[PDB]
């Protein structure tokens, strides 16, 4: 496989971002990583045969590397206690800096692409499509946080971020009362997804979540939030979504891969049809 490892400068973050890349077409699938994103390889390449599966699909595959606990968002400030010496600006990187570089150097189109995320980045994918519909007419969320601003979720997200590299949610979107939480909440932004006619693919798993509170309680919160998202999408006039909630589905790389393979024909028909 002609997979490449690229160094893409980020002016906003003052550093080079590593990007794993496979060509094959002018439009691309952006494969976003989970909460514990490493700085050597994207979790999709560590854990799955994603590149091989999308080889000769007519689509390029882009795996950005890095951004542990970043939610692929633009942060207010550096995370303080873990000594971060810059501000995460991953929305700026994914929507401006990286597509400009890929267009200029490889001819990858900055528009007409798919954003696919899991766990942490499931919501990210939907938010990117909500605010950048020309770039992302297609978004998939696999076990994402679909209502991060509501109820228990700001607390649980804060705990998860702290457990993953010691990152501080307050530095990201402020206290949960800050407008940034609702801005970046897929549930709240459903009217944008509907207005944009975004093609959304939403996978909900079962069992062990992806805090020191009982698993069954977490599972109940997750189930309720997922059902509310699906109901709200329909009630707000959404008509371009795929909602997958198989009983045997899990919150894990094998099933996130299963979903990535399952959506390939869907992405091909939306982006290249």
UniProtKB/Swiss-Prot annotation:
Disruption phenotype: Cells lacking this gene transfer 40% fewer mycolates to the cell wall with no change in the types of mycolates esterified to arabinogalactan or in the composition of non-covalently linked mycolates. As a consequence, the diffusion of hydrophobic chenodeoxycholate and of hydrophilic glycerol through the cell envelope occurs much more rapidly in mutant cells than in wild-type. Residues 51-61 are annotated as: Fibronectin-binding. It is found in: Secreted. Inhibited by 6-azido-6-deoxy-alpha,alpha-trehalose (ADT). GO terms for biological process: glycolipid biosynthetic process; lipid transport; mycolate cell wall layer assembly; response to antibiotic. It is an enzyme of class 2 (transferase). The active site is at residues 119, 219, 251. It catalyses: an acyl-CoA + a 1,2-diacyl-sn-glycerol = a triacyl-sn-glycerol + CoA; 2 alpha,alpha'-trehalose 6-mycolate = alpha,alpha'-trehalose 6,6'-bismycolate + alpha,alpha-trehalose. GO terms for molecular function: acyltransferase activity, transferring groups other than amino-acyl groups; diacylglycerol O-acyltransferase activity; trehalose O-mycolyltransferase activity; zymogen binding. Substrate binds at residues 35-36, 119, 147, 221-224, 228, 251-253. Keywords: Acyltransferase, Secreted, Signal, Transferase. One of its GO terms (cellular component) is membrane. Disulfide bonds: none annotated. It comes from the Bacteria. Homodimer. The antigen 85 proteins (FbpA, FbpB, FbpC) are responsible for the high affinity of mycobacteria to fibronectin, a large adhesive glycoprotein, which facilitates the attachment of M.tuberculosis to murine alveolar macrophages (AMs). They also help to maintain the integrity of the cell wall by catalyzing the transfer of mycolic acids to cell wall arabinogalactan and through the synthesis of alpha,alpha-trehalose dimycolate (TDM, cord factor). Was identified as a high-confidence drug target. Belongs to the mycobacterial A85 antigen family. This is Diacylglycerol acyltransferase/mycolyltransferase Ag85C. It comes from Mycobacterium tuberculosis (strain ATCC 25618 / H37Rv).
């Amino acid at each position: 496989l002609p997979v490449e490892y690229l160094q893409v400068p980020s002016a906003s973050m003052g550093r080079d971002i590593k990007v794993q890349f496979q060509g094959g077409g002018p439009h691309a699938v952006y494969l976003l990583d989970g909460l514990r994103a490493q700085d050597d390889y994207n979790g999709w390449d560590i854990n799955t045969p994603a590149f091989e599966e999308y080889y000769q699909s007519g689509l390029s595959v882009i795996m950005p590397v890095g951004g542990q606990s970043s939610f692929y968002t633009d942060w207010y400030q550096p995370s303080q206690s873990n000594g971060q010496n810059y501000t995460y600006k991953w929305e700026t990187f994914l929507t401006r800096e990286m597509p400009a570089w890929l267009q200029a150097n490889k001819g990858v189109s900055p528009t007409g692409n798919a954003a696919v995320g899991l766990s942490m980045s499931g919501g990210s994918a939907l938010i990117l499509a909500a605010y950048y519909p020309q770039q992302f007419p297609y978004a998939a969320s696999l076990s994402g946080f679909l209502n991060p601003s509501e109820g228990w979720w700001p607390t649980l997200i804060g705990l998860a971020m702290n457990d993953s590299g010691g990152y501080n949610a307050n530095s990201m979107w402020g206290p949960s009362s800050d407008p940034a939480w609702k801005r970046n909440d897929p549930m709240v932004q459903i009217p944008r997804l509907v207005a944009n006619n975004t093609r959304i693919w939403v996978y909900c798993g079962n069992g062990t979540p992806s805090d020191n509170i009982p698993a069954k309680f977490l599972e109940g919160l997750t189930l309720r939030t997922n059902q509310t998202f699906r109901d709200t999408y329909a009630a707000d006039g959404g008509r371009n979504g795929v909602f997958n909630f198989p009983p045997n589905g899990t919150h894990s790389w094998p099933y996130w891969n299963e979903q990535l393979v399952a959506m390939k024909a869907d992405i091909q028909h939306v982006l290249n049809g």
